[PDB]
């Protein structure tokens, strides 16, 4: 009851989404990924090219701070650093909250942390 | 006369050829200006990028 239909779209920097599905606030959109397939590569693209329209939709929300939250649930040696070095590309490491869970970290905290 | 025919078969070729080669000497030179301009257009954007990134980094860092 407390929600209502959103309608302010964002630039994901991938054309295909912002035409066909239209990724708006308060909406989920899982990115299905196979096993033997990358998952990391594609994810990074959405994180450094996530940005509201300034008035291309008829308005912005750039007037209020945009920020990102992260939380990984099981990551190796490469996926650890790979994410961190693209967050310095993002320029966000002073306005983000990271809840990294590794595989060297307990297996029980893989469902707590979410 | 007959020598006046001879001067006209030449005088025709030697303007066709030299008009053609003053429009290749134009053409190469037009593309040469339009390239140097564009290799500096990409240089202009690059520097800007590096400054917009740079300042954001120093704001976050601080």
Curated annotation (Swiss-Prot), chain A:
UniProt superkingdom: Bacteria
Keyword terms: ATP synthesis, Hydrogen ion transport, Ion transport, Transport
A biological-process GO annotation: proton motive force-driven plasma membrane ATP synthesis
Single annotated GO MF: ATP binding
Annotated transmembrane regions: none
Nucleotidyltransferase among keywords: no
Function: Produces ATP from ADP in the presence of a proton gradient across the membrane. The V-type beta chain is a regulatory subunit.
Protein family according to the UniProt entry: Belongs to the ATPase alpha/beta chains family.
Name of this protein: V-type ATP synthase beta chain
Natural source organism: Thermus thermophilus (strain ATCC BAA-163 / DSM 7039 / HB27)
Taxonomic lineage of the native organism: Bacteria, Thermotogati, Deinococcota, Deinococci, Thermales
UniProtKB/Swiss-Prot annotation, chain B:
Taxonomy, superkingdom: Bacteria
Entry's family note: Belongs to the V-ATPase E subunit family.
Reported function: Produces ATP from ADP in the presence of a proton gradient across the membrane.
Name of this chain's protein: V-type ATP synthase subunit E
